[PDB]
Design a protein around this ligand. Sequence first.
Ligand SMILES: *[C@@H]1O[C@H](CO)[C@@H](O)[C@H](O)[C@H]1NC(C)=O
Ligand SMILES: [Cu+2]
Length: 235
Amino acid sequence: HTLVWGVWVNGVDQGDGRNIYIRSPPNNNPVKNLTSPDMTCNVDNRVVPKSVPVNAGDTLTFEWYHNTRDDDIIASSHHGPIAVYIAPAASNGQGNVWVKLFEDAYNVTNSTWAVDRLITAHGQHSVVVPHVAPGDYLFRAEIIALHEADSLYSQNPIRGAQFYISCAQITINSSDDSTPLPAGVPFPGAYTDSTPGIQFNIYTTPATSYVAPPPSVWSGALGGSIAQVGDASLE
Ligand SMILES: *[C@@H]1O[C@H](CO)[C@@H](O)[C@H](O)[C@H]1NC(C)=O
Ligand SMILES: [Cu+2]
């Protein structure tokens, strides 16, 4: 169970974004129903009043939390990958629009899942803003907790992969648009019960065999990290 508090841009805290520039759900409950509209931007997808200004090449950092800011972030048990997607805001996240900017499942050297390192990073993971058209976008951060993912939700609704999905309203101001935004996958729709990385047993299967759900990261992605950028105790 985890939620986004806000974002940072180039290491500058944009402030509490909950229901302001994040389309925040009412609580930190996972989405599990792969067919639900809740997969798009979680259970309360609506336009919120603010959209954070960035430029292409900026570092945009999502900051997650559990109950309060800069707490335990997410239960240790919730091992799994992290992805970030982007879509034009005009889409409202409908259609084949979600382009993947970031994927991290499991770091072989460190022996740590993305979620494990997210905790260590005080809830913070980043993407570099791509050189798409200036305009309004949705950045959809997605944490998949796999601790009950050996079952399918569709078969057993008490279990299943858990999706912690947060859509941030971001406005790209300066960009040369050298990498126009390509089509993307639909949410709901890109993940089905037979998609790799939806059903997995993290207890018996080595993490080095885990394949995260497609799609692949777009060649226009400028990178990202799971790493603390800013200190919530100070700003
Ligand atoms: C999953 O969501 C679909 C689409 O909204 C809905 O029809 C279906 O009943 C849901 N399944 C469960 C068990 O909620
Ligand atoms: Cu949880």
